[PDB]
């Protein structure tokens, strides 16, 4: 069934689950050709597969070569996503396989369900939550590994850095979605907010800066002000 605001704590219970976002799988630049027609050039993409309890992110990089000579690429991308998620589940020991997979766009439901017929006990679900996982490519270290890749490749991250040492997964998810929402609404400002203090660095083995508890509250406030600021610029309120 659909995941929404009524059953939101289910994300953080002890049943293994993954979110799958396919927004950034098939990415193109659109340009004019010499003859003045339009054509696309594809660039590297990625599947964003995330355990919201642990922060474990399975970043499957989608190299442009996987589109070569294929037709109807927007449709193929949903099936390529479903094929790679199925491949991931099969590669995991049984006790690590998810009990549920939540897709962020409903168009992923059939492709994934078809690829996972072999796993009838894994529930494939949509969600009414609008999650900002498309902004994942505003995270510099993630964007860099996607663009540098010369072959298909899976890279594993913890998108919560070390936060779970200090906060619950519910709070770490809330932080993450507010950070991603901010980067999605105004990327420049969000990054400005995150780095304006050169004395807070990003550890080589982390994605986000090493903010103290107190500094995270400030940062969170500034991000909410930004999302409100942009809402105001947008709708003229």
């Amino acid at each position: 069934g659909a995941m929404n605001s009524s059953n939101y704590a289910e994300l953080f219970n002890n049943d293994i689950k993954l979110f799958v976002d396919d927004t950034n799988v098939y990415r193109v630049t659109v340009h004019k050709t010499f003859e003045g027609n339009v054509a696309t050039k594809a660039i590297n993409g990625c599947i964003f597969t995330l355990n919201p309890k642990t922060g474990h992110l399975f970043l499957k990089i989608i190299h442009t070569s996987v589109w070569a000579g294929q037709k109807r690429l927007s449709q193929l991308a949903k099936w390529k996503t479903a094929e790679e998620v199925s491949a991931l589940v099969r590669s995991l020991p049984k006790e690590e396989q998810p009990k549920q997979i939540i897709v962020t766009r409903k168009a992923m439901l059939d492709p994934l369900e078809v690829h996972m017929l072999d796993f009838p006990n894994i529930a494939i679900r949509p969600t009414e939550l609008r999650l900002p996982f498309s902004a994942a490519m505003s995270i510099d270290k993630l964007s860099d590994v996607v663009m540098k890749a010369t072959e298909p490749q899976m890279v594993l991250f913890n998108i919560y850095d070390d936060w779970l040492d200090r906060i619950s997964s519910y709070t770490a998810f809330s932080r993450l979605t507010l950070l991603l929402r901010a980067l999605k609404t105004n990327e420049e400002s969000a990054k400005m907010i995150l780095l304006s203090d050169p004395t807070i660095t990003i550890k080589s083995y982390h994605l986000w800066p090493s903010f103290t508890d107190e500094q995270w509250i400030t940062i969170e406030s500034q991000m909410r002000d930004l999302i409100l600021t942009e809402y105001g610029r947008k709708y003229n309120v």
Binding site: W79, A82, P111, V114, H115, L117
Partner: protein
């Protein structure tokens, strides 16, 4: 021509015989139907005047025996039975024929409707769908469920249609997920035709029987089966040319015969719009599309 003799008509009832219906009043001197065309299956069906709940009836072929109908006052319905004593049967039938107590199947000589609805329906295949093999005729009613409906509850009183499920391992070859989901030709041609039905005549026979049971009994699971079987063909990129042509003919006469006033509960808007306008065979069913558009344009 053959005859179905009735012991009596003790309760008021609407009787149907294939695509015809007539009313019999309580204790009216009714003793059956005569002049039934030899050569086709037939169905004789019932709706009680005091309880339109439970339409029910019997599929039969007069070439396979001498059958008759008697009211059973314990089970409360008109039952088909077989008289094995041929002498007794001819004797029984000739007296009612002489006293003119039998209505005549109105087999118009310019009409092929029944043939066109039953072209591929044979008793042998009906008896595989409806299991009750001590009788040579087969009982169906409004509320019988299908084997697939039981999966989703008595197996003796079920309709054993072939299960069709587009998101099932049978429908989808490992490694051809996208291909086999978006183009059902493997499922239609290799799994169903070559593997289960063996030929297209058996597949069309089940299709036609599913429609007839939906229409005559309002059997909801038969209606699902008819739509599923259509959609599998229309959703297959590769279908033999002769099946598409015959399918167009099958459907044309089903649509032509459907009561206008039952169209809302017998026709699935999604399947038909998909089949006629989006599917691989959107342009391959000229006769059916033309009749659907002129008869049920609301649904489209």
């Amino acid at each position: 021509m053959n005859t179905v003799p009735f012991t009596s008509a003790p309760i008021e009832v609407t009787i149907g015989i294939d695509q015809y219906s007539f009313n019999v009043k309580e204790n009216q001197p009714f003793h059956g139907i005569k002049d039934i065309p030899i050569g086709h299956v037939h169905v004789i069906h019932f709706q009680h005047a005091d309880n339109s709940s439970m339409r029910y009836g019997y599929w039969f072929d007069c070439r396979m025996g001498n059958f008759y109908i008697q009211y059973d006052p314990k089970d409360g319905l008109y039952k088909m039975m077989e008289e094995r004593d041929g002498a007794k049967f001819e004797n029984i039938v000739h007296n009612f024929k002489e006293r003119q107590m039998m209505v005549s199947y109105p087999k118009i000589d310019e009409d092929d409707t029944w043939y066109n609805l039953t072209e591929f329906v044979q008793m042998d295949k009906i008896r595989k769908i409806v299991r009750k093999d001590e009788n040579q005729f087969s009982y169906v009613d409004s509320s019988m469920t299908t084997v697939q409906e039981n999966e989703l509850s008595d197996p003796a009183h079920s309709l054993n249609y072939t299960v069709i499920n587009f998101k099932s391992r049978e429908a989808i070859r490992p490694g051809h997920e996208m291909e086999d989901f978006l183009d059902k030709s493997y499922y239609l041609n290799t799994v169903m035709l070559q593997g289960i039905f063996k030929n297209s005549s058996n597949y069309f026979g089940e299709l036609q029987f599913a429609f007839l049971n939906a229409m005559f009994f309002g059997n909801y699971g038969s209606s699902l089966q008819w739509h599923a079987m259509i959609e599998l063909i229309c959703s297959s990129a590769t279908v033999p040319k002769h099946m598409l042509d015959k399918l167009d003919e099958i459907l044309y006469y089903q649509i032509k015969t459907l009561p206008e006033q039952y169209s809302d509960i017998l026709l699935n808007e999604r399947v038909w719009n998909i089949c006629l306008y989006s599917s691989f065979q959107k342009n391959s069913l000229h006769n059916t599309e033309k009749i659907m558009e002129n008869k049920y344009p609301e649904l489209l």
